[PDB]
């Protein structure tokens, strides 16, 4: 429902077109660590198809999207879906590091946290920080789930 | 003797209501359900099975019941099953060059029309007819010769 031509109307310099806001390195590393605690204690999914299925089904709490997907159209739909479903999402620089935090031997373009076992408070703080960054970038806030 | 399915020849408007019977491709799923088998069981028994057909003919049902009774009572030996007994797949060399990919098939017209109606088929068919001097190609201008002769002899 969210129109892509208006959502991606202002691409940021030096980034793929699907990246809406700049995520600092400390926030990206923080989100990677929350994905790590979710994998060891709660529940996560890794891979674009599984993450899209989670976001559609409504079981997603936080989505992580890589900024180094070579064909960007592989993951370009995920931010639009996250905005339509009101799920917070954050960008991470390396799909290789995203896959390592997800626990697989290969890179992952996207990942999602279904349940954050020992990382609920950290996830809330991260969501608030991404919400403030979206506020600076002009997009509306996406409340935690 | 393994029975052969009997089906109705399609009654065309040209025929005017004259109907006849012919040997069908296989027994229908309704006819097989009438005797208690599916397509897999029938093909294992060696019957010809036509899962596409919708008709159910009582003569087919009676023949199936009789032959299956002989088979189950051991007075008849069923043939080998009507399933593929060999799998021979050849390595394909130069499919793109011989036009066997999807683009080649589309350009040859097999996506839209039948193989018999494609233009290359027409070319090969007429070439073979002219080479062998077959049915109509044994004489050139046969239709015009017939037309003029009919005019002269029926005036």
């Amino acid at each position: 429902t969210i129109d892509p031509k208006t959502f991606y109307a202002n691409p940021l310099p030096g980034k793929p077109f699907y990246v809406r806001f700049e995520v600092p390195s400390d926030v990206a590393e923080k989100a990677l660590e929350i994905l790590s605690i979710a994998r060891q204690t709660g529940k996560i999914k890794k891979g674009t198809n599984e993450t899209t299925k989670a976001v559609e089904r409504g079981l997603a709490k936080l989505v992580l999207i890589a900024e180094d997907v070579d064909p960007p159209e592989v993951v370009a739909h995920l931010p639009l879906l996250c905005e339509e479903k009101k799920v917070p999402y954050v960008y991470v620089p390396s799909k290789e590091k995203l896959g390592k935090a997800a626990g697989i031997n290969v890179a992952a373009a996207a990942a999602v946290v279904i349940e954050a076992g020992q990382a609920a408070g950290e996830l809330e703080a991260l969501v608030n920080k991404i919400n403030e960054i979206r506020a600076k970038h002009g997009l509306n806030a996406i409340p935690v789930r | 003797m393994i029975p052969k399915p009997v089906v109705q020849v399609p009654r065309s408007i040209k025929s005017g209501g004259v109907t006849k019977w012919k040997e069908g491709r296989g027994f229908s799923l309704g006819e097989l359900k009438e005797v208690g088998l599916n397509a897999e069981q029938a093909r294992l028994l060696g019957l010809p099975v036509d899962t596409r057909r919708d008709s159910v003919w009582p003569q087919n049902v009676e023949a199936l019941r009789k032959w299956l009774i002989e088979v189950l009572e051991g007075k008849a030996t069923p043939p080998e099953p009507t399933l593929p007994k060999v799998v021979k797949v050849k390595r394909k060399r130069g499919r793109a060059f011989r036009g066997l990919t999807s683009a080649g098939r589309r350009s040859r017209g097999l996506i839209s029309t039948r193989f018999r109606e494609t233009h290359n088929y027409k070319f090969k068919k007429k070439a073979k007819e002219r080479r062998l001097k077959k049915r109509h190609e044994a004489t050139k201008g046969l239709g015009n010769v017939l037309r003029i002769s009919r005019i002269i002899n029926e005036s």
């Binding site: 031509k5 299925k53 739909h77 | 390595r91 130069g94 999807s102």
Partner: protein, 184 residues
């Protein structure tokens, strides 16, 4: 709905304008690279997966750039009747997709073309992606789809024995479970 269904939207009306904005920048660098280039991943993943792409060893995706328009029809330099002297508008019965498939097959000798798909156009060039398979790779030989290209044999003794055993067991079962119902 899978992720590939959403991936397809960039080649639909809803995502066309943003995809066209992306292509206006990607095509600048594509116009400078060689005519045929092996790529790590297909540009249209869902289309490639439909056409039979998998990320296995021995599967090659090649981007091919060629010039559009009708083929280079030649004006005859010898005597012809007037119907046979035309140039403009006469085209070949081959398409540029098949031309791109043949060119990629020439570049990768011994590999077999599986399929190909259009990717983009500019004023002069058309871009295709051709999927090719190495039939000598063990990872390709046993694939159920790629075996149709690379060959496959089954000894007739295996199929005949299994079918005969199945038929024997089926008659034995039907003797119990169907004969009284048939006869009654």
């Amino acid at each position: 709905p899978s992720a590939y269904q959403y991936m397809a939207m960039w080649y639909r009306k809803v995502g066309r304008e943003v995809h066209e904005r992306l292509m206006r920048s990607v095509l600048i660098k594509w116009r400078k690279e060689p005519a045929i280039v092996r790529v790590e991943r297909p540009f249209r993943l869902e289309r490639a997966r439909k056409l039979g792409y998998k990320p296995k060893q021995g599967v090659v995706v090649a981007r091919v750039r060629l010039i559009r328009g009708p083929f280079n029809r030649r004006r005859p330099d010898s005597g012809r009747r007037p119907k046979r002297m035309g140039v403009y508008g006469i085209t070949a019965w081959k398409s540029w997709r098949q031309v791109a498939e043949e060119r990629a097959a020439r570049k990768f000798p011994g590999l077999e073309v599986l399929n190909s798909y259009w990717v983009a156009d500019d004023g002069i060039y058309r871009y295709f992606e051709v999927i090719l398979i190495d039939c000598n790779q063990p990872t390709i030989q046993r694939d159920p789809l790629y075996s149709g290209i690379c060959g496959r044999e089954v000894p007739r003794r295996r199929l005949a024995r299994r079918l005969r055993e199945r038929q024997r067991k089926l008659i034995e079962h039907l003797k119990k479970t169907l004969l009284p119902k048939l006869k009654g």
